[PDB]
Amino acid sequence: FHISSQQHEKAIKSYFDEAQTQGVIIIKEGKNLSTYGNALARANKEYVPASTFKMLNALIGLENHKATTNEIFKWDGKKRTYPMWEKDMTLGEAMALSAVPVYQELARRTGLELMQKEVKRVNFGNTNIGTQVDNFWLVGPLKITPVQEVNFADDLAHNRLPFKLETQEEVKKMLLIKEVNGSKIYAKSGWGMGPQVGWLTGWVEQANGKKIPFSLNLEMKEGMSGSIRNEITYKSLENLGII
Numbered sequence: 291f292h293i294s295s296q297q298h299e300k301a302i303k304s305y306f307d308e309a310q311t312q313g314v315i316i317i318k319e320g321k322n323l324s325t326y327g328n329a330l331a332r333a334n335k336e337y338v339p340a341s342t343f344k345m346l347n348a349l350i351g352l353e354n355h356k357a358t359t360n361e362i363f364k365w366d367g368k369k370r371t372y373p374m375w376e377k378d379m380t381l382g383e384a385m386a387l388s389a390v391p392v393y394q395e396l397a398r399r400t401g402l403e404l405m406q407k408e409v410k411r412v413n414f415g416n417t418n419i420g421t422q423v424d425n426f427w428l429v430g431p432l433k434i435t436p437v438q439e440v441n442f443a444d445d446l447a448h449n450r451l452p453f454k455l456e457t458q459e460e461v462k463k464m465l466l467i468k469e470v471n472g473s474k475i476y477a478k479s480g481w482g483m484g485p486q487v488g489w490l491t492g493w494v495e496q497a498n499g500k501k502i503p504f505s506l507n508l509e510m511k512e513g514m515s516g517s518i519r520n521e522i523t524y525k526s527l528e529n530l531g532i533i
């Protein structure tokens with residue numbers, strides 16, 4: 291509808307302003323990155339990946355045969371932080387529910403060494419996982435920037451990461467979170483509770499098959515629900531005509 295750039299920029303900054311946080315949303319068309327939001331300098335700062343790490347955690351586990359996509363991870367019967375986690379699930383269900391115990395299990399099956407080696411080989415963030423195989427993505431030392439996250443999403447959306455095509459297709463089928471008038475949104479959220487960072491990193495796949503990667507990165511505040519990350523992302527992507 292021939293909207294100015296100034297006006298797209300202003301509408302998107304105001305989504306972040308109206309949520310009373312600081313954040314950025316990076317979009318990639320082709321090789322070109324565009325940063326929007328109310329705190330542009332966040333784009334190249336380092337944050338914990340938190341649960342966005344599940345995406346690489348799954349790739350690595352599936353590649354190295356530590357799980358299959360059919361395999362049921364049994365709830366062991368301990369009280370878990372949310373009721374939705376007190377059930378048996380597949381890697382894919384666990385991705386939708388962001389179920390830490392399943393992903394911690396998978397990380398322990400991979401083991402620190404194969405994990406350190408594979409995070410180096412795919413060159414994710416600062417690539418340092420420290421000595422603790424089951425929490426490194428939440429409290430350090432692993433860190434990543436919003437630009438590295440959209441680049442990561444871009445790689446995965448186009449099967450360019452160093453993993454078999456089928457492993458990549460298996461993890462991607464797990465990430466479908468929304469369908470809007472012929473578009474599909476694939477993404478993983480993240481919330482570094484261990485200032486708390488919030489992510490939503492992914493791509494939109496358009497009707498015509500074109501794929502536009504994005505990473506939202508913002509500060510999660512006291513009593514904000516996780517779903518603002520989705521609301522701000524849907525509003526930004528629509529404003530830009532991407533969905």
Ligand SMILES: *C(=O)N1C[C@H](NOS(=O)(=O)O)CC[C@H]1C(N)=O
Pocket residue numbers: 339340341342387388389390428478479480481482483484516
């Ligand atoms: C991931 O960053 N986490 C796992 C779980 N679900 O997260 S989501 O809403 O960000 O998708 C709870 C919180 C968080 C964590 N503390 O590990």
